[PDB]
Amino acid sequence: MNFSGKYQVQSQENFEPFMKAMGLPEDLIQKGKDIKGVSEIVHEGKKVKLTITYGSKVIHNEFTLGEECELETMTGEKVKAVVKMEGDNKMVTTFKGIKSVTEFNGDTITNTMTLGDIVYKRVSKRI
């Protein structure tokens, strides 16, 4: 399907509770709470190059679909995980008890991460 492009967050639910349970330090939660971050994807085959920019904070991640790689979380911690291609438009992965589902529909990306009873929801559109 090719997911290349630049997108910006339009809306989100449960950012604070989810981020809290992730151990993201208070002040950052307060700061990123109101930042409409930009995400850039470069998709080439099973190679996904991902860059997330939140104001002055940037995180670079790169992984191969199906392969176990090391993902950098927003705290700085690094984890190992396999990102899978579920269906034709969904990228699914699991780490630290979190279940992550990214669904692509043209200009719209919908991301859903569930931790316990919390469901952090993000809706982005291509810019």
Binding residues for (9Z)-octadecenoate: 31, 39, 54-56, 122
Query: Binding of ligand OLA at residue 73 (CB under 6 A)?
Result: yes
The answer to the question of residue 39 lying near ligand OLA (CB under 6 A) is: yes
Q: Which of 1, 10, 23, 55 binds ligand OLA (CB under 6 A)?
A: 55
Q: Is 115 in the site for ligand OLA (CB under 6 A)?
A: no
d(CA 60, CA 51): 5
Does 69 engage in binding with ligand OLA (CB under 6 A)?
A: no
Site for ligand OLA in 2-21 (CB under 6 A): 7, 9
Which of 14, 61, 112, 114 is the binder for ligand OLA (CB under 6 A)? 61
Q: Is 50 among the residues that bind ligand OLA (CB under 6 A)?
A: yes
Q: Does 85 sit near ligand OLA (CB under 6 A)?
A: no
Encode the chain in three state secondary structure: CCCCEEEEEEEEECHHHHHHHHCCCHHHHHHHCCCCCEEEEEEECCEEEEEEEECCEEEEEEEECCCEEEEECCCCCEEEEECEEECCCEEEEEECCEEEEEEEECCEEEEEEEECCEEEEEEEEEC
Distance between CA atoms of residues 87 and 124, nearest Å: 20
- Judged by the rule CB under 6 A, the positions of this chain that interact with ligand OLA are 7, 9, 22, 28, 31-32, 35, 39, 50, 52, 54-57, 61, 71, 73-74, 83, 91, 93, 100, 102, 109, 111, 122, 124
